Amino acid sequence: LRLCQVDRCTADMKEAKLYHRRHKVCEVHAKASSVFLSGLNQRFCQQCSRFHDLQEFDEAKRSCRRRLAGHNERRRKSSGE
Ligand SMILES: [Zn+2]
Ligand SMILES: [Zn+2]
């Protein structure tokens, strides 16, 4: 079944799980070392289960920046009149 978003993919999903068949992804692509998508390097994100570019990933952790990294409260504007 050829239902993988990744182009130039030659993986056979004749017998895959509902987690790989539903999301339309390969087990090898799910936890691969940066796939070649649209020419650029795009890795998987177990956080959102979607696909994110490499520029978005950072640090030893290969996950999304949101939540993982931590935006923290912090302040921007001040109170006054
Ligand atoms: Zn694939
Ligand atoms: Zn994500």
CATH superfamily: Transcription factor, SBP-box domain
Strand share of the residues? 5-15%
Number of helices: 2
Bound molecules: zinc ion
Envelope shape = elongated
H/E element string? HHEEE
Class inferred from helices and paired strands: alpha+beta
Distance from N terminus to C terminus (CA atoms, Å) equals: 63 Å
- Major beta-sheet overview: 3 strands, antiparallel
Give a description of the structure.
The protein has helices spanning 18-22, 27-30, and strands spanning 35-37, 40-44, 51-53. With 81 residues, it is of the alpha+beta class. It has a single domain, classed as Transcription factor, SBP-box domain (DNA-binding domain of squamosa promoter binding protein-like 12 (lacking the second zinc- binding site)). Strands 1-2-3 form a 3-stranded antiparallel beta sheet, with no helix packed on it. It is elongated. 6% of the residues are buried. One zinc ion binds next to loops.
List keywords for this structure.
monomer, 3 strands, 3-stranded antiparallel sheet, 11% helix, alpha+beta, Squamosa promoter-binding-like protein 4, binds zinc ion, DNA-binding domain of squamosa promoter binding protein-like 12 (lacking the second zinc- binding site)
Architecture blueprint of SSEs:
Layout: H1 18-22, H2 27-30, E1 35-37, E2 40-44, E3 51-53
Antiparallel strand pairs: 1-2, 2-3
Bound molecules: zinc ion (ZN) (2 copies).
One zinc ion is lined by residues 45, 47-48, 50, 52, 64.
GO molecular function: DNA-binding transcription factor activity; transcription cis-regulatory region binding; zinc ion binding
Keywords: Cytoplasm, DNA-binding, Metal-binding, Nucleus, Transcription, Transcription regulation, Zinc, Zinc-finger
Motif (Bipartite nuclear localization signal): 61-77
